[PDB]
A paper describes a structure:
Here we applied protein engineering technology to target virus-encoded deubiquitinating enzymes of two viruses with significant impact on human health: Middle East respiratory syndrome coronavirus (MERS-CoV) and Crimean-Congo hemorrhagic fever virus (CCHFV). The CCHFV vDUB domain is located within the large (L) segment of the genome, and has also been explicitly implicated in the evasion of host Ub- and ISG15-dependent innate immune responses.
Both UbVs bound in nearly identical orientations as Ub.wt with interface surface areas of ~1000 Å2. Substitutions common to both ME.4 and ME.2 at positions 46, 64 and 70 were found to promote more favorable hydrophobic interactions with the enzyme relative to Ub.wt. These extensive interactions are not formed at the PLpro-Ub.wt interface with the Ub.wt residue Ala46. In ME.4, Asn74 extends into the active site and forms a hydrogen bonding network with Asp1645* and Gly1758*, which mimics hydrogen bonds formed by the same region of MERS-CoV PLpro with Ub.wt residues Arg74, Gly75 and Gly76.
Author numbering:
A (entry chain A): 1481 to 1802
B (entry chain B): 1 to 7, 11 to 75
Amino acid sequence: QQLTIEVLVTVDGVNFRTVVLNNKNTYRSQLGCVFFNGADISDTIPDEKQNGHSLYLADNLTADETKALKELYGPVDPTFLHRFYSLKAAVHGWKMVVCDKVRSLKLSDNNCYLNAVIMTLDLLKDIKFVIPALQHAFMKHKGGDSTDFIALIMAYGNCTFGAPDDASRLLHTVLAKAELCCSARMVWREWCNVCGIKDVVLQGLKACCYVGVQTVEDLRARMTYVCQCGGERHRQLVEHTTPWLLLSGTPNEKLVTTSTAPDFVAFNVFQGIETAVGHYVHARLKGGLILKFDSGTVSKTSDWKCKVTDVLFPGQKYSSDC
Amino acid sequence: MRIFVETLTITLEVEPSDTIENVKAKIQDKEGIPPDQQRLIFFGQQLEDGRTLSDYNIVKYSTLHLILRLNS
Ligand SMILES: [Cl-]
Ligand code: NA
Ligand SMILES: [Zn+2]
């Protein structure tokens, strides 16, 4: 050819392989989709400068790289790695501001739902992620560097850069990949007039989340559905010990006031019409006031007429002989 | 195995080994709701695409609740 370089190729930053290249074809034709220092260089012709440099490979993986990719990220779809590399580059321009030691994501490219997701996640004690790459990015985020964690969340959530998205959906999809590092139990008593009574126990993190109610009064109320036998089966919470409680419902317009001494510690708000593009806001209760974190813009109020979606309560201690 | 999906309320014939994505494709087939816009809830848990109905202990005559993805 005309000149030869050697590059190092990785999908995890731990294991690298050497690939010999020339300047007669692009990276994509010789090797595949490659990122150099966070930038896609696949359609460029290799130059003597990049000799010895490292490249992150997003396709054309070898058998060993595919195994390592599964251990690092779990079972992902064929587009996941390229989407994660591209998101990470696109979210590079975002800013994570800190107001009185509270992290918050500035508004940009309709990312307000990510603001509510991140700040809700920052209030969850003792959560840890079971996907190693998701846990590594989490520690980075807790250490002040959120790029990987933001990008990974959007990749696992099938989120698109620039498009608005569902904060509650992404929060629970993220939480489905985590586990609790303490004790939590949730005992549901079920009974049908034909079959009888059976108690059902939920352990760990899933004992701390419920999608369908927004108050602990509705969580503890009696529910009714169809039994396997085909008749009325009932169900009710009879025991609950948690470090906290996340309840998520549809946008529900209520009046939130601090003169009533509310029991929850934080909540997310959906602003606008549900059949239109809405704007998410994260809110916390401090000093007998409502601290609204509108994507890097802080406010304080005593009352707020808003449509809540997620609500976060302190730990639960509950018993009920039903 | 018959289950109910509350949208109205309709009925699906499924297998315990069917994936959530497989269940979502049937809801699309009968209701025209694209799978990525569907949010399926059961026992207060959001069903993730990669897992099966058996993973969530979904049985005969179980009721799944359908929420639409906001914004989108
Ligand atoms: Cl009873
Ligand atoms: Na990268
Ligand atoms: Zn029965």
